[PDB]
Assembly symmetry: C2
Homo-oligomer: 153 residues x 2
């Protein structure tokens, strides 16, 4: 019934964090946790396809996209399953993560278990930037920290 | 039909490694990769229940054991699903991992995706030691390095 997961974000720089996930049956996934070391403002935050840290965050591949859609914000019909929009860091570099999402899951075809969470250098423009890169990544830029999403007690 | 997984092992000390997994249909899981920084000799090697690195390797919990059995070697009827026996390092501290196992899986109820691989301080006694500890851990001792098992391309 109740499924839990966890993700420790690490990178080459100062950004680090711990993300928690909970899903009750086929309900929304509730995403919580804290990221530190960020620049003030909005940072893209997505599930990427592969739980592969062999080349740091690069080997996580693109956004998780089992329905073969273009990039959007989490409220858009046209989005990747992994598209969880932006987290916001305050003056102190701390982002408090508080997201509910209906497309990701912790079981079945939409499961993010064994995939990667990434937090980016720049704001995700939610697919509205009017260049091709917007339709793939939201122009969120480099991957500051990432972690493989694991099963939690 | 074909599933691939990967696991990057890290710890507090010098031990590191990369583990690859492949499962074609309901063939066995073929486990490969390299572990470095080990003392010469045998080191226990298991799937632990939780993909939780919030407290290093400690938070991975016990050996993955959905059938509530006693610890064993991979050839024993009585084993944990996660029991993959020992890997061996020579004088260079390098273990070349080469294992085939039919109880672990990369999908379904016995999936190890999102769980943790651990490499240990000591030899796994394969549950043959005459004490309670053998029946839980194989007397494999401390957890030198671990990582969350992720979905690979
Ligand atoms: Cu991303
Ligand atoms: Cu172990
Ligand atoms: Zn996207
Ligand atoms: Zn065991």
């Amino acid at each position: 019934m109740e499924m839990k997961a966890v993700c420790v974000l690490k990178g080459q720089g100062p950004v680090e964090g711990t993300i928690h996930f909970v899903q009750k049956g086929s309900g929304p996934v509730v995403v919580s946790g804290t990221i530190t070391g960020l620049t003030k403002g909005e940072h893209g935050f997505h599930v990427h396809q592969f739980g592969d840290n062999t080349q740091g965050c690069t080997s996580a591949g693109p956004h998780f996209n089992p329905l073969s859609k273009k990039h959007g914000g989490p409220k858009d019909q046209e989005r990747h399953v992994g598209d969880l929009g932006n987290v916001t860091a305050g003056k102190d570099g701390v982002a408090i993560v508080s997201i509910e999402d209906s497309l990701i899951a912790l079981s079945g075809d939409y499961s993010i278990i064994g995939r990667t969470m990434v937090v980016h250098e720049k704001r995700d423009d939610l697919g509205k930037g009017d260049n091709e890169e917007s339709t793939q990544t939201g122009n969120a830029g480099s991957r500051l920290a990432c972690g493989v999403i694991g099963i939690a007690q």
